[PDB]
Amino acid sequence: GAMEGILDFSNDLDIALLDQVVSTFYQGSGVQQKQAQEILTKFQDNPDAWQKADQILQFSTNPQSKFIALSILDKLITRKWKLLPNDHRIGIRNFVVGMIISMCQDDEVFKTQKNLINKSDLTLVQILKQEWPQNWPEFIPELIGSSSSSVNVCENNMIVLKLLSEEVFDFSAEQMTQAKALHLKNSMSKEFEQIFKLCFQVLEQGSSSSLIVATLESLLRYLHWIPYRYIYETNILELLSTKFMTSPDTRAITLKCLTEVSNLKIPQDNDLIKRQTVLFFQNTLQQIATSVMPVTADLKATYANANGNDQSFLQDLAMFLTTYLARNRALLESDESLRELLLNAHQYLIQLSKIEERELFKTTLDYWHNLVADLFYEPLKKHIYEEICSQLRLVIIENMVRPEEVLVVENDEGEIVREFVKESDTIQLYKSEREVLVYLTHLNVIDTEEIMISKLARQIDGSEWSWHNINTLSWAIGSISGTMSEDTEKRFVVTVIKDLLGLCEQKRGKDNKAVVASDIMYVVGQYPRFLKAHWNFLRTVILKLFEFMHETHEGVQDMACDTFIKIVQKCKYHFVIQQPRESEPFIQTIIRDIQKTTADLQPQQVHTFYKACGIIISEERSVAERNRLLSDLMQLPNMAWDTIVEQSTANPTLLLDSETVKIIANIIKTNVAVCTSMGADFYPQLGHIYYNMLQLYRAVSSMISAQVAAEGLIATKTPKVRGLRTIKKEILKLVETYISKARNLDDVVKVLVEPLLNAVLEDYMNNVPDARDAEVLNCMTTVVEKVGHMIPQGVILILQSVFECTLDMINKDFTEYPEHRVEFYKLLKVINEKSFAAFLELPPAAFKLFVDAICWAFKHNNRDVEVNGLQIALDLVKNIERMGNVPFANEFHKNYFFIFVSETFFVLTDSDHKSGFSKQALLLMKLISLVYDNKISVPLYQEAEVPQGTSNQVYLSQYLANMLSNAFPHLTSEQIASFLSALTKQCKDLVVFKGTLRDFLVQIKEVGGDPTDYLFA
Amino acid sequence: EEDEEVLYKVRAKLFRFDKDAKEWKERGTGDCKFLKNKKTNKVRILMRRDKTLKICANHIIAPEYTLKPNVGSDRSWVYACTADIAEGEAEAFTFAIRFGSKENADKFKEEFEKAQEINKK
Amino acid sequence: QVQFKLVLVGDGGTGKTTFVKRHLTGEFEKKYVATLGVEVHPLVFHTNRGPIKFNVWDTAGQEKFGGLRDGYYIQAQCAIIMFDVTSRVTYKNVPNWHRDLVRVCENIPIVLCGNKVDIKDRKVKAKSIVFHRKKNLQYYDISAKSNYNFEKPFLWLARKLIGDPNLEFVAMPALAPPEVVMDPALAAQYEHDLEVAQTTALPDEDDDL
Ligand SMILES: *[C@H](CC(=O)O)[C@H](C)[C@@H](O)/C=C/C(=C\[C@H](C)C/C=C/C(C)=C/[C@@H](C)C(=O)[C@@H](C)[C@H](O)[C@@H](C)C/C(C)=C/C(=O)O)CC
Ligand SMILES: Nc1nc2c(ncn2[C@@H]2O[C@H](COP(=O)(O)OP(=O)(O)NP(=O)(O)O)[C@@H](O)[C@H]2O)c(=O)[nH]1
Ligand SMILES: [Cl-]
Ligand SMILES: [Cl-]
Ligand SMILES: [Cl-]
Ligand SMILES: [Cl-]
Ligand SMILES: [Mg+2]
């Protein structure tokens, strides 16, 4: 209402009203705040709004108002600066400088308005990016002079130089042209001598000042780029590593500077520099020990307490120590006078590694890995660190995270339960811990064993018993598999198991039993080498796992199945052969009793179990025996199947039964499971069910269609219809799985393909959109991938059946039918790669849709689609080029060459497709190079459009200049011309070409971009 | 909740029907508990979100309520609730509650109806 | 009351608004409706140290919908930086968001969040995620969809702002609910309203639950 008034500019700006609106937005709530927000955004966005900027800065009694005023200028400076008349530029500079000077002189404003002053500085720095130093040569000298006049101004200058260094060196790559970035870096470089001088003097004439802190803040930025001599040839390392370490308000920033120093480009063979690098570390460690905490201090406890800035400091210390040592520890390793330092630093790291903070722990673990990996290889180094490593072994063993395989966890009520979900975020952490622990074991296998065995004893006797302690220990024991000799491993593992069993014998109740079960399972699963040598033991282990498959505790049960397959993946050979003193291969035993064993399992566990059997059976290389085993394995699912097939054939109604649908689905899934592990070997079992299975696919398809007709689209949501579709989907999955692994491609084509296409294509094409399975598309991709070359008429059939109907599902927006969308483009891609002829056969109208489809894919933000769209495009171009000077190639170029060029430019230049930049650039380069290399045999221009002689090169430039000129009317002709010259010349050098593109993207975001920037080389 | 007996507990996911939009929206995942007040003998549904422990359902299992099936699910019930106080002020919702299994859905219904009888007395 | 300004920043489509909504109402918004400038929401948590109120300033990640941009950060007392682990560019831009944030808010606790870990094809590897170390940001893998670690950013921030590392979320007491009888009049409409509900399919019928 009243609020909106400020948007009317024909009226003079009521500043008071502005402040009300601003305060409403910042301190208000609900509807009022919301309306103010919209208002303020509109005000800000108004392109004249900057003209009100001085008025606001002068008269507002509200800092957020002026902040917003500054955001308005910032927008103007960064985007429209060079469009402004010269006097508005002078005037803007002047009132920005003046406001800064003015705010720095009044100590109250200086003290309590930091946000507004920081904004002002940043705004100033934006002006410097535009105007400095070419149109503002004296700014650095005058900043240096002004500094000595006032403590407030001097400090604020440090803020300004920090911001400038940031904008020039840290954040220029994305935001400036290559030429302008170089100009500014060069400019800063040429005058840094004097900048440093000021920085050093200030640092020498103060101890614990906001000015000192500010100066050091700026120094942290400079260290990213300054020459090393400024650091090593002045007294600055001494000051940083002593004086600035002692006061806590300077200590934080100094330690970060010192970390950065530990990364300077530094001569390798200079003994004096080496000494300086030792000295600052030595100084720094000394200040820690005497000013902060001794090496013995409980950092775990300190961090946990979280006083003041303790967490941050400890974090920054870890970062300093790990950084320095990773680069420099060798400087400390040979000289005995430096041994204590080296070990003390590492002792701090040991204490740091005890802290309970996962992210911090990963930082130190990275360091430990760097250390141990080096000690594993570098001669004569490991003995130095023997005591550190010994402590580290303890730390890692006591902080082992739960492996992904250990499926039981303790809930908030002290109960051992199955996990609700995967601990997805501890996967990389476990791998990291294992890696380090594995190296430590190699480094001293006696120490590692003694530690684990003795920890185990303190579990047995009760002294240290607890779920946590037994767990972390068990996990560690399992994680070192492969580090010991078979012999040591033998004894080791024997002891561990005896002890874990004895331990289980002692404990009672379901929770205890679950825990010890999970730990035993994890350990045995981790030592296949042992299992392979101990048949009796192995057999007994598997039988116990089978017992667990009847467990009422679900976590244990589930873990038993996973453990079973994990063991089988490694030891299958010992299940397929007949072992001494055994009357049959164990696989025979497993199969004979399969109904009993899996009786209490959930269906997917049953499938896993069948998958494991498949692994074993595939070990049998005698074809007769293997097929017989496969037959025996599939006895139950095949007998269920046979009976079902009779019923379906008799009448389609019985399939209607929900129970029957579930039975069928589980039969197919079982087949999928076994096919997954047996691959090529699965063929005879596939052949048993195949014809009836495709018949069933049809019958079930009719049911779905009938249900939709009778109940509406909503039928697709029903349990019944989802169950019927599951059948279809599993059938598709089974065929896909087999075909993806098939070794006899002739049989695929001669036996499998024709009935499959006949069964699936028309059904897909002739269903309503919501009833079409995306899996059909996925199945067809594999079919084309594997036998595409052998079935040209088949590929044509696939296109005909799925192309236009699928495109029409996905071409109204970017979101609907996400699965179809993804699978559609994967199918198009493989077809384009393997059976391009199929696209040649398309009627010209359908070929146009194909080109539309490809460009449509470009415009997706979805990476799965976008990436494929760009690849198809590149591949297509290649396919065309390959045809040579023939009419189809010529027509293609005449029709589509410029469509591809402009579409590629569109997604390059719209800021909404940044993820695809690389592949976009590759495509654009290919397209341009086709013309540059005269690889297009016909004029790209229609006659009389241009003179007859005219080259495609000239015409391409002309088309592009015109395109860009209309699409970006704020560019000058010379910018466009210069851009195109550069781009076309660089069409053979992808890295340069890409840089020229990025420069263009910078320039289109502002006015008055320098055309000579495209000359950068 | 110290003045209450836990009759039934089951892990669940609760939806509320947005009518203006034509969609179900999740309200919470967690333990759905049936709680009998030791003083009044009244039986309520109380359900809290995992981790934040925020109340996502709090209402008497009124004798008038009827658990109806949802068209999409064999493991869910839908019913109209006239006075849920989870958010604060007493408020009417159309609720849907889905379970890990059909067994759980069937068990819930049974217990719900037993509770309704207790609530009648 | 004990309330804190929280600013939530990061690239478009990273899951910022969905994340907040999840906490606000429990719902999972499947649709992507770009935030226009900023959306301010009150969010209360119950803790063993009493209630803590966040005023969550859920900002626009798309440049073209950016509105006041860094103007939103003024006097923020904490922040969450969001990226999408299935989109590398979103991680690449993390330093940019951080930069603009800390220029305005010099000393606040900040959580870095890698969202959408529910999605199988992860692009930003766990090992790659190190930007937070030198900047003293807390990091969590999260999913607004699966609720993986969804409470962690707020729990950590609450600990840091209240200054108590042993702070926990606690169960709010649950008032006796009323004894209401459905009134004669609306009983007719309740049948219509219920009907629409029964015949509208519940979402994600394939989830565990
Ligand atoms: C609790 C039991 C209890 O209530 O006390 C636990 C959780 C158990 O239920 C779980 C046990 C599991 C596996 C066991 C390790 C399987 C048993 C194997 C076994 C007894 C094998 C025999 C044949 C041996 O070889 C025995 C005699 C031998 O001493 C073994 C243990 C050591 C070896 C191999 C010595 C050698 O020299 O070869 C859950 C999977
Ligand atoms: N798979 C998955 N999708 C998610 C997750 N979180 C959000 N999304 C989805 O990602 C899309 C974008 O979410 P939204 O919250 O709008 O993102 P935003 O960061 O607020 N975008 P903007 O900055 O433009 O306002 C939505 O479709 C949403 O459903 C997640 O954890 N997993
Ligand atoms: Cl301000
Ligand atoms: Cl020098
Ligand atoms: Cl083997
Ligand atoms: Cl010009
Ligand atoms: Mg949003």
Which two three-digit tokens encode residue A17? Answer: 């009203």
Which secondary structure element, helix H or strand E, spans residue A356, and what is its range? none
Give the ligand whose atoms come closest to the C-alpha of residue A118. Answer: 3
Nearest CA to ligand 1 atom 5: A505
Alpha carbon of A623 to those of A165, A558, A620, A686, A840: distances in Å?
72, 33, 8, 15, 43
Evaluate whether A67 touches C71 at the Cβ level (below 8 Å). yes
List, in sequence order, every residue forming a beta bridge with B97; answer none if it has no partner: B14, B77
Token pair of C44, please? 């209360």
Nearest to C139, CA basis, from C127, C147, A366, A905: C127
The residue written with tokens 């478009």 in the block is C12
Q: Tokens for A956?
A: 């391409």
CA A718 to chain B, closest CA, distance in angstroms equals: 5
Q: Which atom of ligand 2 is nearest to the CA of C61?
A: 23
Counting Cβ atoms within 10 Å, is residue A650 exposed (0-12), middle (13-18) or buried (19+)? exposed
CA distance A548 to A597: 10
User: Whose Cα sits closest to atom 13 in ligand 2?
Assistant: C15
**Spatial separation of the C-alpha atoms in residues A827 and A848, rounded to whole Å:** 18
A71·C68 Cβ contact <8 A: yes
- Residue bearing tokens 């944030």: C101
Cα separation, A539 vs A11, whole angstroms: 92
Contact in structure between B32 and B45 (CB atoms under 8 Å): yes
Residues 6 or more apart in contact with residue A993 via CB below 8 angstroms: A921, A924, A925, A983, A986, A987
| Inter-CA distances, A674 with A51, A601, A613, A617, A778, Å | 75, 17, 8, 10, 20
Select from C13, C40, C87 the Cβ nearest to the Cβ of A33.
C40
Note whether B99 contacts C: Cβ–Cβ < 8 A: yes
B80 part of contact set with chain C, CB < 8 Å: yes
Tokens of A417: 């339960």
Three-state SS at B42? coil
Asked if the Cβ–Cβ distance from C198 to B12 is below 8 Å, we say no
Q: Whose CA is nearest to atom 1 of ligand 1?
A: A504
Ligand 1 atom with minimal separation from the A543 CA: 16
Structural domain range at position C143: 1-209
Contacts for A296 with CB less than 8 Å, ≥ 6 apart: none
Nearest-5° angle of CA A557, CA A561, CA A562? 115
**Residue among C32, C69, C120, C146 whose CB has most ligand 2 atoms within 8 A, to mutate:** C32
Would you say A671 and A689 are in contact if contact means Cβ atoms under 8 Å apart? yes
Task: Please name the residues in contact with A844: beta carbons below 8 A apart, sequence gap of 6 or more.
Answer: none
- DSSP annotation of A401 reads P
Cα torsion A614, A616, A622, A628: sign: negative
Structure tokens at A1010: 């320098």
Give ∠ CA A290-A294-A298 in degrees, rounded to 5: 145
Residues C7 and C79 sit within 8 Å (Cβ to Cβ):
yes
What is the 3-class SS of chain C, one letter each residue? CCEEEEEEEECCCCCHHHHHHHHHHCCCCCCCCCCCCEEEEEEEEEEECEEEEEEEEEECCCHHHCCCHHHHHCCCCEEEEEEECCCHHHHHCHHHHHHHHHHHCCCCCEEEEEECCCCCCCCCCHHHCCHHHHCCCEEEECCCCCCCCCCHHHHHHHHHHHCCCCCCECCCCCCCCCCCCCCCCCHHHHHHHHHHHHCCCCCCCCCCC
Nearest-atom index, ligand 2, CA of C31: 27
Q: Is B64 on the interface with C (CB under 8 A)?
A: yes
Side chain identity at residue A840, one-letter code? L
C42: left (phi over 0), alpha (psi -120 to 50) or beta: beta
Closest alpha carbon to A353 in A317, A324, A385: A317
Q: Are A292 and A352 a contacting pair, CB within 8 Å?
A: no
Query: Which of A388, A383, A384, A389 is closest to A347 using CA atoms?
Result: A388
The answer to whether the CB atoms of A359 and C96 lie below 8 A apart is no
SS3 A906: helix
Separation of CA C134 from chain center: 24
B22: nearest CB among C45, C172, C200: C200
In three-state form (DSSP H/G/I as H, E/B as E, the rest C), the secondary structure along A500-555 is HHHHHHHCCCHHHHHHHHHHHHHHHHHCHHHHHHCHHHHHHHHHHHHHHCCCCCHH
Three-state secondary-structure class, residue B11: strand
Concatenating the DSSP letter of every residue in A412-429 gives TTS-EEE-SS--GGGHHH
- In this structure, is the dihedral angle defined by the CA atoms of residues A21, A26, A30 and A36, taken in order, positive or negative? positive
- Residue B55, SS3 per DSSP: strand
Classify B80 as helix, strand or coil. Answer: strand
Is C11 annotated among the ligand-binding residues? yes
Residue C74 CA: which ligand is closest?
Answer: 3
Name the residue facing C127 among A115, A316, A428 (closest C-beta): A428
Is C61 annotated among the ligand-binding residues?
Answer: yes
Chains A and C: how many Cβ contacts under 8 Å? 94
Q: How far is the CA of A974 from the centre of ligand 6 (A)?
A: 4
Q: Identify the H or E element spanning A986.
A: none
User: Rounded to whole angstroms, how far apart are CA atoms A721 and C20?
Assistant: 35
Q: Which ligand is nearest to the CA of C15?
A: 2
Please report, for chain A, the start and end positions of each structural domain, with discontinuous segments joined by +.
1-1017
Q: Which residues contact A113 (CB under 8 A, 6 or more apart)?
A: A63, A103
- C-alpha–C-alpha distance, residues B95 and B17, integer Å: 6
Report CA A493 to chain centroid distance, whole Å.
Answer: 38
Q: Nearest 5°: phi and psi at A779?
A: -60, -45
Which residues of chain A from 285 to 304 reach within 8 Å of chain C, CB to CB? 304
Q: Under a CB-based contact definition with an 8 Å cutoff, are residues A494 and A537 in contact?
A: no
Q: Are A956 and A928 in contact (CB under 8 A)?
A: yes
Can you name the residues that pair with B29 across neighbouring β-strands?
A: B13
Query: What is the gyration radius of the CA atoms in chain A, in angstroms?
Result: 37
Taking the C-alpha atoms of residue A1004 and residue A1013, their distance in angstroms, rounded to an integer, is 13
Domains in chain C, number: 1
Find the ligand nearest to A232 CA. Answer: 4
Pairing relationship of beta strands C78-84 and C110-115 according to DSSP bridges: parallel
Structure tokens at A632: 């025996």
- Chain B residues lying within 8 Å of C156, measured CB to CB: none
Q: How far is the CA of A904 from the centre of ligand 1 (A)?
A: 66
Question: What CA–CA distance (Å, rounded) separates A78 from A70?
Answer: 12
User: What value does the CA radius of gyration of chain C take, rounded to a whole number of Å?
Assistant: 20
C21 marked ligand binding residue? no
Q: How far apart are CA A615 and CA A613, in angstroms?
A: 5
- DSSP structural state of residue A169: I
C-alpha dist (Å) from residue A708 to A579, A732, B72, C203: 57, 21, 14, 19
Ligand 2: list residues with CB < 6 Å: C 12-18, 29-32, 34-35, 60-62, 115-116, 118-119, 143-145
Count Cβ atoms below 10 Å from residue A983 Cβ, excluding itself.
21
Cis peptide before A133 (omega within 30 of 0): yes
Distance from CA of B52 to the nearest CA of A (A): 13
Contacts of A424 in chain C (CB under 8 A): 117, 141, 148
Task: Give the dihedral sign, CA C91/C93/C99/C102.
Answer: negative
Task: Please report residues of C whose CB lies closer than 8 A to that of A817.
Answer: none
Residue A1013 carries which DSSP code?
A: G
CA angle, A214 as apex, A208 and A215 as ends, to 5°? 90
Q: How far is C178 from chain A (nearest CA, A)?
A: 29
Q: Which amino acid is at A75?
A: K
| Residue in C37, C88, C89 nearest the CB of A41 | C37
Cβ burial of A693 (10 Å; 0-12, 13-18, 19+) is buried
- Whether the CA torsion A766, A772, A773, A778 is positive or negative: it is positive
Instruction: Specify whether the CB–CB gap between A778 and A826 falls below 8 A.
Output: yes
Query: Which is nearest to A529 in space by CA: A559, A561, A573?
Result: A573
Pocket test for ligand 1, best of A467, A501, A553, A557 (most atoms within 8 A of CB): A501
> Would you call A808 exposed, middle or buried from its count of C-beta atoms within 10 A (0-12, 13-18, 19+)?
exposed
CA pair distance A703, A710, nearest whole angstrom: 10
B56 touches chain C (CB under 8 A): yes
For tokens 């379901």, name the residue: A510
Helix axes A917-932, A863-883, angle to 10 degrees: 20
Residues B51, B57, B58: CA angle, nearest 5 degrees: 120
Residues of chain B positioned with their CB less than 8 A from the CB of C209: 11-13, 29, 98-100
Return the CATH architecture of domain B1-121: Roll (2.30)
Q: What is the resolution of this structure in A?
A: 2.0
- The helix/strand/coil state of A737 is helix
Q: Which amino acid is at C80?
A: I
Cα distances from A796 to residues A762, A871, A883, in angstroms, run: 13, 21, 19
Cβ atoms < 10 Å from Cβ of A96: 22
CA A880 to chain CA centroid, Å, is 35
Residue pair B71/C201 in contact by the 8 Å Cβ criterion: yes
Cα separation, A427 vs A831, in Å, equals 37
String of DSSP letters for A23-81? HHHHH--HHHHHHHHHHHHHHHH-TTGGGGHHHHHHH-S-HHHHHHHHHHHHHHHHHTG
Say whether C35 counts as a known binding-site residue. yes
In whole angstroms, give the CA distance from residue A927 to residue A634.
55
- Tell the residue nearest (CA) to atom 8 of ligand 2: C15
Cα A554 to Cα A416, A417, A597, B21, B37: the distances in Å are: 10, 8, 15, 40, 33
Pairwise CA distance, residues A706 & A708, whole Å: 5
Triad C31, C32, C35: Cα angle to 5°: 135
Nearest-Cα distance to chain C for B33, in Å, is 12
- DSSP β-ladder status, C78-84 and C3-10: parallel
Give B 55-94 residues with CB within 8 A of chain A: 71-74
Inter-chain contacts counted by CB atoms under 8 A, chains B and C: 126
CB C27 within 8 A of CB B25: yes
Cβ of residue B51 closer than 8 Å to a chain A Cβ = no
**Strand, helix or coil for residue A799:** helix
What per-residue string of b and e applies to A873-884 under the rule 16 or more CB within 10 Å gives b?
Answer: bbbbbebbbeee
Max Cα distance, chain A (Å): 103
Which token pair is A706?
Answer: 């009938």
Say whether B94 and C194 touch across the interface (CB within 8 A).
yes
- In three-state secondary structure terms, B95 is strand
Relative to beta strand A408-410, strand C78-84 is unpaired
A857, A872 Cβ separation under 8 angstroms: yes
Query: Chain A: residue nearest C142 by CA?
Result: A425
